[PDB]
Design a protein around this ligand. Structure first.
Ligand SMILES: [NH3+]C[C@H](O)c1ccc(O)c(O)c1
Length: 392
């Protein structure tokens, strides 16, 4: 029946959540720098913005188990709507807060909102569709919104902030979220759909599988690279290249564009190149690009390594999703939500361990040494993907 509306709702929710996640990057560190300064200074700022950026991932990791039980007992629509309500509250807080603590609280609330939406929307979208093969395409469209949301984020936030102020982009996000919530609450309230009773193996024993662990570690490291890049590159650019405030999003644009291109091409080229081969090459490439990043002096020197990072991360994600699915289907019993639960756990871990440790290491020894360390870790972990050597 009216299932395309549900697909649209989930797509919009994921896109808006990722947009709100990635708009913060060019604006918050510069704003805190301007407050404090107008060296131990900006170093304490790096070590504090690391925690501020890791707060959302930590809260999401903690609150993820509870939302599944809640939607099991009560049904998807209430968590789906609560996600938009909490996202609206968090967006208004960021726009009208100046202190550090209120920014931390807004990020924490965004964590719960993101987790609730990511769980309940995926559950509804999986439940509503009838064909498993048709279910294959619709997930790709849902994740496509996530990749597109992180694309227009940094440039829209940075250019709008530098010309108008600190409030315009957050107000725009508030308006869009309110419109989406109005659509959700008005256009459809026909029935309250409950999740399927087919529950697979618990995530604990699933994570206890060594092959699942290898795939999860690969994904976690590949995402932790860019997760550590995100909250420190603006500060390094401002301190070294004395760049204006509108270029801090143009710096991150090529990475997102390359992520889109790499995901799209290798979602078709993976099974012809061999999935383990594609993942191995992706890990090696992202390691080398991360190694090459600190050698730039101008943005023109940052154009290429960001391209490589985005391309390789797309390769790794596209190669590692179906391998996770196949391993879960073979060694255990499988439901469509188990793969996304594993992927969400890996992503939240990569974004929770990245920024804090990255800030601490950058304060201790510097930015280039941190990038060298993470690149070498990626290079060393790359050959471990050989154990995904399934004969088909
Ligand atoms: N899965 C998303 C991935 O971490 C990511 C995030 C932001 C980006 O600009 C990107 O290229 C990739």
């Amino acid at each position: 029946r009216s299932r395309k509306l549900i697909l649209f709702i989930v797509f919009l929710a994921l896109l808006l959540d990722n947009m709100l996640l990635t708009v913060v990057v060019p604006i918050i560190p510069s704003y805190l720098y301007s407050i404090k300064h107008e060296d131990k200074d900006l170093l304490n700022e790096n070590v504090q913005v690391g925690l501020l950026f890791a707060s959302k991932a930590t809260v999401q990791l903690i609150t993820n188990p509870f939302i599944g039980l809640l939607t099991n007992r009560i049904g998807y629509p209430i968590p789906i709507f609560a996600g938009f309500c909490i996202m609206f509250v968090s967006t208004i807080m960021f726009a009208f807060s100046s202190s550090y603590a209120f920014l931390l609280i807004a990020r924490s609330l965004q964590g719960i909102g993101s987790s609730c939406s990511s769980v309940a929307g995926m559950g509804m979208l999986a439940s509503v569709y009838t064909d498993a093969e048709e279910a294959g395409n619709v997930m790709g469209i849902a994740l496509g919104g996530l990749a597109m949301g992180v694309l227009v984020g940094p440039p829209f936030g940075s250019v709008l902030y530098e010309f108008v102020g600190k409030t315009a982009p957050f107000l725009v996000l508030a308006a869009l979220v309110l419109l989406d919530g109005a659509i959700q609450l008005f256009v459809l309230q026909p029935s309250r759909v409950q999740p399927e009773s087919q529950k697979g193996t618990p995530l604990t024993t699933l994570l206890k599988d060594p092959y699942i662990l290898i795939a999860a570690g690969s994904i976690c490291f590949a995402n932790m690279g860019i997760a550590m890049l995100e909250p420190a590159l603006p500060i390094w650019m401002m301190e070294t290249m004395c760049s204006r405030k509108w270029q801090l999003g143009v710096a991150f644009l090529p990475a997102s564009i390359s992520y889109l291109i790499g995901t799209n091409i290798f979602g078709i080229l993976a099974h012809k190149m061999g999935r383990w081969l594609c993942a191995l090459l992706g890990m090696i490439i992202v390691g080398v690009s991360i190694l090459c990043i600190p050698f730039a002096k101008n943005i023109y020197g940052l154009i290429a390594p960001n391209f490589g990072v985005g391309f390789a991360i797309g390769m790794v994600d596209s190669s590692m999703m179906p391998i996770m699915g196949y391993l879960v289907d073979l060694r255990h019993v499988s439901v469509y939500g188990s793969v996304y639960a594993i992927a969400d756990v890996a992503f939240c871990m990569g974004y929770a361990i990245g920024p804090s440790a990255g800030g601490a290491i950058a304060k201790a020894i510097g930015f280039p040494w941190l990038m060298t360390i993470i690149g070498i870790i990626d290079i060393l972990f790359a050959p471990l993907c050989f154990f995904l050597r399934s004969p088909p």
